[PDB]
Amino acid sequence: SPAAMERQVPYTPCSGLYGTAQCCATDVLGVADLDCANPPATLANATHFESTCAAIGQRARCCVLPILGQDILCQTPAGL
């Protein structure tokens, strides 16, 4: 019984252009990046991540690091 799977590897957050997993706010129309910061919780899975942002009254959206010269990009994984 080789123990090679028993030791799971570090979870891999939002894989994509944004590569990061956080919790931000949105405006009335839905387009905005109000109050953006790292999400404090124990991430276990997709739904678990959604519960992380809902915990403080926010939604799950993976934002990409700001780049002087372009607009801010952010979207939800699998429409979570």
Curated annotation (Swiss-Prot):
Predominant location: secreted
GO cellular component: extracellular region
Keyword Signal set for record: yes
Residues bearing carbohydrate: N45
Keywords: Cell wall, Disulfide bond, Glycoprotein, Secreted, Signal
Biotechnological exploitation: A chimeric hydrophobin named NChi2, synthesized by grafting the Cys7-Cys8 loop from EAS into the corresponding location of NC2, was found to be able to self-assemble into both rodlet and monolayer forms depending on the incubating environment which suggests that NChi2 can function as a versatile bionanomaterial for various applications.
Compartment(s): Secreted, Cell wall; Secreted
Highest taxon in the source lineage: Eukaryota
Positions of disulphide bridges: C14-C62, C23-C53, C24-C36, C63-C74
Acetylation in keyword set: no
Role of this protein: Aerial growth, conidiation, and dispersal of filamentous fungi in the environment rely upon a capability of their secreting small amphipathic proteins called hydrophobins (HPBs) with low sequence identity. Class I can self-assemble into an outermost layer of rodlet bundles on aerial cell surfaces, conferring cellular hydrophobicity that supports fungal growth, development and dispersal; whereas Class II form highly ordered films at water-air interfaces through intermolecular interactions but contribute nothing to the rodlet structure.
Family the entry assigns: Belongs to the cerato-ulmin hydrophobin family.
Quaternary assembly: Homotrimer. Further self-assembles to form highly ordered films at water-air interfaces through intermolecular interactions.
Protein name: Class II hydrophobin NC2
Upper taxonomic lineage: Eukaryota, Fungi, Dikarya, Ascomycota, Pezizomycotina
Name of the encoding gene: NC2
Span covered, complete protein: 19 to 97 of 97
